[model samples]
Target: STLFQALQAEKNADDVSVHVKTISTEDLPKDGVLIKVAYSGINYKDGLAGKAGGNIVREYPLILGIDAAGTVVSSNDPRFAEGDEVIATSYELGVSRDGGLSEYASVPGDWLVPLPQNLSLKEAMVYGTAGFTAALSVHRLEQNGLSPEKGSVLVTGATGGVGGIAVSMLNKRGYDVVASTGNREAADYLKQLGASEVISREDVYDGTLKALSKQQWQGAVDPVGGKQLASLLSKIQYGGSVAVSGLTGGGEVPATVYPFILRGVSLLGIDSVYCPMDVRAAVWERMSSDLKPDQLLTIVDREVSLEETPGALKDILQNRIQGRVIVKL
Candidate 1:
């Protein structure tokens, strides 16, 4: 209650330094809802906040976790009463404000999504932002026209948190999920998450460029953007759509309009951070019911404490992380 552990990132000249500090709860920024945090998750963006030039953090000496799930200890907004369980992610959470990775967190009441009927605090955190992003991608895909009957769906960066969950979520929805990863050794791991086929990263993006190749997948959940997306675009089925969320590979997409004009393909951009509360709530409901992946634990690499967050954050930045790293408070 007095000294609680938290991960803080401070700007030191050109370097962004990260640390696990023992600080009083009163030091945490107070805004809307106070939560006794049960679990927090490490995401690629959380890693960026601590990495120089990653440019995710807008302020110095800030908490670096974006996803949190816990019980309400206090609240200013009557919408959330004490003892109610909640999940908070994005909305400038860890980037501009004190975030989870602590014994307590103060999140705006509007940002809070009441934990779904069947989702426990810990279980909700296991999905966190990464899982939520995957589900959001699928939701957009389905709304547009993606269906299992079309063809296989490709999930790049399949070993990472988003791709792994996307694989299972797509598979659960009856889609044949083709998981593409840089790690060839993790094929078994991908299959365990219900990937119908595991292909190498190079298989998706071979060096020689093609403006339009043979159509393959019906849809895709692409977290690894860059030139590969350029290559993937050429291979999408006619009238197929691709949901683009992250840029783990790179941001610049070297693509042409042939896939769009000739084949009627579309790319759906996914933004989970500022998604409408209504749609956000609806997606979480699906996460608890139908879209929830059966292979939840397989998507988690490991669990750690606030003290180990500095290393976990570095692991994600270095691409040494395979799955989600959850912090237990």
Candidate 2:
């Protein structure tokens, strides 16, 4: 029997505890391909999984990782062969079942994406769910008529994973990128990641809610939701759009219809969790190519061992981290 290490979470009554534990291949789910995980990462969801009241976990005693990149060891599915490199993220992973925070993982074939050419397992995990979501956000914006000549594009929560990568990718695609963040210290960091300009959170919202504001960006990638997003909608140029993926700010959006009715603004909802497989493949392909940030490594705050992930998880939830944290298995 092959024994391996995995980060597992267990809950009792009102308590939740997370730690690395020894497990065997038999412990993995049986319906998918077995993979020898090479790397994973600490996402915001993974961080919440370790907290007692985080409410991210639907079941107790499960592994805690939202994404994984690795080499296939064995597969019952015809689509994946042994030794194939692969990526899996989002679909009930780490929440309802055991997930990628292990030396090995058994993932459903439908949830797996073939490692795109020119993308190594390590680099794939570097992008993880965050980069993929950012890619999707950009893709949706382009599909909705955004272009380099369409004035500037804004990226909010610019130091966080999705927003950070969005800034880099938008810049790589020749868009004038205006990055906004609550942390002033990350201004230079965002610039280094290709932000043409950096603005404070106050510059975007200013604690004042408006039904309409000056036309600014042609498009925006927003991982932050709530009143700020509602405020941001007012600032979009006519016929522009915003791709929203996360709710780090709050979920309740106090928005008015004036932007949509008068400015012809589009608020596109982005869902990385249950993104279609074909679209997921397309996004991964783009991430390995044009959307791949030139300063991809610059987005990595640190690389921690699997055993070190717990502390890293806690750190991410506290917003103490500036960029991505890769978990090396």
Candidate 3:
């Protein structure tokens, strides 16, 4: 039996504990494509999965990681073969079963996407779920009439994982990007990634809600939902759209229908989890090609080994992590 390092979370008497431990190959889920994971990224969800009261992990003592990029060691499905490069993220990964925070992971073939050209294993995890979610946000926005010519697009929660990648990805596509963040310190970093202007969170919301405010942005990518999202809807240009992927700020959107009816503003909900596989594959290809940022790796705030993942998870939950964090397995 081969031994491998894994980050496992277990529950005891209403407390959840997470740490790296050595486990055998036989401990993995019985059948799927076995991958020699090269890299895995820490996501906000992964952070929640490790903490008690987070309500993310479905079962105790499960490995914790939502994103894995690696090479296939063996496959039960004909679509994948030994030595093929693949990426697996979302779709009950890191939550319901043994996940990618391990040296190896066995995932269903349908859960895997063949690594798109121009993206490496390390790069894949760097983008991981956060990046993928951002890309999907941008894609949906464009489909709903977003273009560089449409004026500046805003990215809220600018210093966080999805916001950082959305800023860069929009910039890569030649959009005039306006990034809004609570962390004023990251302004220079956001500009380097191509934001023409970086504003504070207050600049976007202002603690005031109007039935319809001055139309500012032609479109926006927002991972921070709630009252801010409500504020954002009132500000999108007529017929423009906002792509929202996460509710980190809060889930309740106390928005009025004036923005939707009078302005024809669209609110697009983004769900990386359980996104149709066809769209998932298409978005990944765009990530490798058109939406891929030139300074993609720069979005990574730090890289940690498996042993350091526990600390990384804590940082993400506390909002201490600025950008993406990847695990070099």
Candidate 4:
């Protein structure tokens, strides 16, 4: 394989452009295990990396992919050898250097995790960073005091990547999941992904500013942060926690301190990027085991080829994507 047919992104004045470009191994960084990439997922960051004002990538002519799964071809690390299945995500793999948007990727050994036996290479990509983030969110919640008997958990942006996966994972553990999405058209879809209840975006944030709302949920997994986040905090039950990770809705958060001061509600910030390796590997291991959802594939809304990636990136920008889209390289 040439390891040269990679999707590359470049800066264009105030905007950024991306396309398929052939790159040599010499064009890649000179360290780490060489992986023959099998699959990659289109994450929110990947779309923003090429947008006119999206600052996801500070460098140019770079391959954009935060999630990749495949087998190793060669490695300097004794822990990895030829034909070992592995996952490369987060860290600086896709942001500062080449990612899995190509046939091959060179990744630091520290950033790569041995693919868990319970997960196939393809299944791992289906989870990818979104699924892992969802798992990590649940893991963090359970580390607190979350339990299925606590109450129905709210999963905001339930039609998106992390939200969809979180709903499924939470439901798998027997929590009655309340899924919220602006795309009410996907209500039936979210339910089939293990959400016991599906609500519209308005159900969560009606644009009304309330210092406190009815305690509707004992726990929440919110990836669509913004003013909506403030509203969510007001609704969480006393001692309940919200694991937040994205800004799909908006970034500015306006809120009162009542949730924390009066209710003891906690806002747990979730960051899959640069998470400690021990925690990252442990989370992935859990994902492949007890945390693995039976409805895992239900979260995959569609599949796209490498050639269709450019358009897929734009589709997410338009907020038209319903769930995860895997790139079959």
Candidate 5:
């Protein structure tokens, strides 16, 4: 029980060498609770970390999962005991520290949350960082006064994990959901996930950035930054906000102050890493209850084993994947 199989990333010239290999419990970092990892979720960031020379891992020969859910096997902290179900994420689990691409992981007490009663281990990974980020985006939007009565909410990069989850969550919460994707193939899938309408990614960026465009969205959740976000900013309804999370499209956001100053639009930057514990807990609670997506079960496209992770990594980077890909450890 003390030995486990772990997926490791070794730095190569331009790619990270990845493999699943056996490791000893003594090799893991000292921590508050030890978990027998049940499920881990893959994200765009995890794919980059698993690749060579990506600069995502920040450490060589490290485990490469950013988020995980499991049952406690051992606990040094009184807050958790053996057999407690828990989920751990976004606290150096897969960035600068050894992560959850393994059968077991030792994590700090503070980083672990009691698995919400409504979600199972498998269900937890389906949400993972993607759902959590989406929930946070909605939370901020609500705080800024966005509501379903205002109008439709737009989600960019609709087929990807974050955008997919955002669409579902927004729709379940009564907002009319408009999903935007570069690939036309995802239109049906987006509709299934509760998107009231699906738009081409080009449709969002093809136009010039007027000081203001038609007031279309009550708010927006954007995982694709760059021009896509700038376009969303110009078109949001008055008093609406856009929560920006990923830079998958590009990092640079070019825009004028007209939307912010004249229309009173807000652009909220969302980062899963370094989010405060209280806020993180609140988001998880919502994912378990109020913000729970109606089609949460359909969000995960596949559940793969550790041996299949490397290929899956490549698929995500190539944009050949849809929905979430979970790792059943």
Candidate 6:
């Protein structure tokens, strides 16, 4: 069968050379189920892969998308069928392997999860990796014994995809959510998503990182690392926990063990990638039900065709994009 896919032929340090190309079914890798992709979402990592030649692609002329939601078109495994709706994420989908930025994708059976009955294909992509990471962060916080009664939970990078979803999910669960963002323009939008308080990123950065700062937050979901994470570590309540996911701020974490040793605080590393299938499934199940965000649709700021992916990817790299950007196949 003939298939159409977005191909990144040559790497560019500032601009991505993406094109729509036609290929044969035989060009697809041998694995799990073949999915006719209905939707895919652009992520920060996808932007990095598209621009800057991050070596994100194990092979050249690759399809670049980390998350996809669609219906199964064919399967050799009994777990899925030809018409079942499903979602695929992480695990080298867009990095080392041909990913979801195509009309069709063949992913390993283990990487596939049945689309939660509560969510449609568009809804699933709305959550995508951004929402998935937020849910996983919340799951880790709960595992560490955080509760609504504890106090406010802080979400750093509150304007971005993960931060926006985290604020919505945390507020839905009855937790007091404090959204910290550099973008003053998004404060109202953040509040609409259920953030009780919107603090300037400068405010957090102004505070010094002492061994134990004032115990303000009971828990935290941080996508911004570097100084912001360092500050969060010192300010969490005694025995509280913070889930750390992204390195948007910078990967070099200049933190001390003072929070751990003095206040008994914990830093939980959230890794959606390489997560066990069962655990990922459980997270998705919760997201489809109780953990689903009220402003789910509002989070998707833009939807573009596959042909527009190159520009979208560049926008994300420059931090010019906001909320979720979905690609309709």
Off by over 4 Å in 4: 1-3, 12-14
lDDT of each: 0.87, 0.90, 0.89, 0.87, 0.87, 0.85
Model 2: residues with Cα > 4 Å off, grouped in runs: none
Clashing pairs in 5: 15-52, 16-51, 16-52
Error of 2 at 256 (Å): 1.0
What lDDT does model 3 reach? 0.89
- Local accuracy of candidate 1 as per-residue lDDT tens digits, 70-168: 999878887999999999898988888888777788899889999999888878888989999999999998987899999999998898888989999
Error of 6 at 247 (Å): 0.5
- The residue pairs found clashing in candidate 3 are none
Query: Tens digit of lDDT per residue, candidate 3, span 1-329?
Result: 48899888888778888878888878888787889899998999998888876978776889987899999987788899999999999897898978886988888998899999899999999998999999999999988988888789999998899999999999999999999988878989999977999999998987678888888999899999989999999989989999999988888998999989998889999999899899999999999999989999889887899998888888988888878889997
- Which clashing pairs does model 4 show? 4-23
lDDT per residue for candidate 4 within 163-245, as digits (tens), equals 98999899888899999988757888988999899888888999568888889999899999998888899999988999998
In model 4, state the lDDT of residue 189: 91
Question: How many clashes does each candidate structure show, in the order listed?
Answer: 0, 0, 0, 1, 3, 0
For model 6 the local lDDT of residue 181 reads 83
List model 5 lDDT by residue over 1-329, tens digit each.
Answer: 46788998887675568888889988888765888999997888898887656767776879987899999988899899899999899878888888877988888999988898999999899898988988999998889988999889999989888999999899889889999988877888999999999989877888857778988888899988897788789889999999998988887888989999999999998898779988888889899989887789778887988888888878888888898899997
Tens digit per residue, CA lDDT, model 6, 1-329: 67576545455454446666776677888775888999998888887777656656646667777899999888998888899998999998888888887888889888999998889999898898999999999999999989999999999988788998999999889899999988788888999998999999877776656666778899899998888789778889988999999988888777898999988889999988899999999999999887987788878777988877777877876767777889887
Candidate 2, which ten residues in sequence have the lowest lDDT sum? Answer: 52-61
Off by over 4 Å in 3: none
Worst 10 residues of 6 by lDDT: 7-16
Clash pairs of candidate 1? none
Error of 4 at 219 (Å): 1.0
lDDT of 2 by residue, 244-327 (tens): 999988889999989999989899999899999999999999998889878999989989998887789888888888889898
TM-score of each: 0.96, 0.98, 0.98, 0.96, 0.97, 0.96
